[PDB]
From TrEMBL, chains A, B:
This is L0052. It comes from the Bacteria. Residues 86-107 are annotated as: Disordered. Pfam families: T3SchapCesA (PF11439). Residues 87-100 have a biased composition (Polar residues).
């Protein structure tokens, strides 16, 4: 009766994990964006002196991005989990070849 | 300075990203939960008489994840991403070595 459950579960998990990593990848791409606020006025400042004046006021960028403290090691734990889902050295771990129900197999 | 939106935004993203890894972790465990009693039932149907009785009630709900080939490659790409965000061996990014402590290291 699992057929009535695994009719959407597979798709659900696929789309779920797919979206999770996409959001996280977006998060990690916003950090350098905020840090790029240290030169909001580049060509504009070069053209207009008043814009260059604002440059001395808009020279920020480091506010809430350097939060890689206790949460930094949290990412290290993720790698550990991924490694746990890896072969590490071999793929034949615990599992063993079976397929007894074949009736005279060629291979 | 950027603080109006950065008020509680950090907590929002922190908790959200924390949900991803927890949700994904559960999905991985579900694969073992489903594909658990397979060799202990299907294979044992031929061997044990009681096992064959149970197989007559639940036979569809074992192999539902044998597409592990190009999918794992995507996860490996995730590792590379994490590694790219890590200083790895070059631990000099936004930091420096010290070793400013000896006091006669005769032992």
């Amino acid at each position: 009766m699992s057929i009535v459950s695994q009719t959407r579960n597979k798709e659900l998990l696929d789309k779920k994990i797919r979206s999770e990593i996409e959001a996280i990848k977006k998060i990690i791409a916003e950090f350098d964006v905020v840090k790029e606020s240290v030169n909001e006025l580049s060509e504009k400042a070069k053209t207009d002196p008043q814009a260059a004046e604002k440059l001395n006021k808009l020279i920020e960028g480091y506010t809430y991005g350097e939060e890689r403290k206790l949460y930094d090691s949290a990412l290290s734990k993720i790698e550990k989990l991924i490694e746990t889902l890896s072969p590490a050295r071999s793929k034949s771990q615990s599992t063993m070849n079976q397929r007894n129900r074949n009736n005279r197999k060629i291979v």
